[PDB]
Structures are given as structure tokens and as C-alpha cells.
Design a protein around this ligand. Structure first.
Ligand SMILES: [Zn+2]
Ligand SMILES: [Zn+2]
Ligand SMILES: [Zn+2]
Ligand SMILES: [Zn+2]
Lengths: 72, 78
DNA sequence: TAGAACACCCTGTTCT
DNA sequence: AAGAACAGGGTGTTCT
């Protein structure tokens, strides 16, 4: 019942991982564009939780990958 | 000189009392009008706020606006 | 479940 | 200088 990426409430397995809906669509958008232009403003370790996941796409997106998320 | 004191992009004038670029000018007005907006840093409250990163952390960008002295009444303060 | 799309929000520029 | 508002993007939900 918990997103592996942002620890929000998960809506099932998306792209191989238990994630919420916001993290599902975020991951899709990133891998298809787009992630090449992401740059963390901290230290590549931002907190990704429900309230702060919007802040750093670079860390969000790295969390996605590390959690296993994958297209096929 | 000619650089924004909040983000270091090219400053365009002295806005709300401080040399800043246009994007920080309207960021700051939008932050202090209405609110609470609210902004939280996902880092350690010391994010790098520059042209390429200032969108990532409105919390640190707003703190840098305040720390530089921005204030609405800077005009009517003569 | 994967993807479309809408509504809403944030940003930075123009303002004929 | 200050402020409105347009255009462009991002987010997250609903819908299919
Ligand atoms: Zn999530
Ligand atoms: Zn980060
Ligand atoms: Zn600036
Ligand atoms: Zn920050």
C-alpha cells in the first residue's frame, strides 16, 4: 500500500514496481523525453516524499530507476 | 553589478529593493502575495539557486530573496 | 495495467 | 520600477 518511490499510497505495479499514480506517469514522461535535462540543486540525495517529490525530478527519476522501474 | 542577487542570472533592475532578474522579481511578488503556497526544501536548505536550478527549490529561492533584502514596500520606502 | 487527456499549477516573458 | 496576463511546461487525477 506504499509507493516505493515517494512513499505515497500505491495504486499497484507500474513498470515493474509498486508505485503511486503520480510516480507512474512521472516515470513514463521522464524516460521518454526528458530526463537528460534534469539537474539536482542539492547533492543528488533529495528527500522524495508526497510533498517534495515535485521539487527534484533528477532525484525522483533516480529513485524510480533504483526501485527497478523499467519500460518492458 | 549586472547580476541577479538571488539567482545570478542577468539582473534587469532593482526590484523590491534589490538587483534581480525579471523571473525572481515576479517569483518574489507571487510568493509574498497570497501564500502560503507552501514550500519545503527536499535538500538541506542550501540548494544552488541559479538559472538552470532555481525552479527546483522555491523554498531556497524564496529564502535567498528574503536574505538579499527583497521587500514589497521597498518602493514606498523612498 | 498502460496511456490518453483535462484541469490546475508554476514559471518567465511581453505588454501592438 | 510595478504589475497583469499570455504562453509554455509540469504535475496528478480521471477516464478509457
Ligand atoms: Zn510515488
Ligand atoms: Zn535532488
Ligand atoms: Zn534571478
Ligand atoms: Zn532547497
Amino acid at each position: 500500500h506504499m509507493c516505493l518511490v515517494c512513499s505515497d499510497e500505491a495504486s499497484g505495479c507500474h513498470y515493474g514496481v509498486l508505485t503511486c499514480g503520480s510516480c507512474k506517469v512521472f516515470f513514463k514522461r521522464a524516460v521518454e523525453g526528458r530526463q537528460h535535462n534534469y539537474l539536482c540543486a542539492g547533492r543528488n540525495d533529495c528527500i522524495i516524499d508526497k510533498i517534495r517529490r515535485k521539487n527534484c525530478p533528477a532525484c525522483r527519476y533516480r529513485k524510480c530507476l533504483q526501485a527497478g522501474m523499467n519500460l518492458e
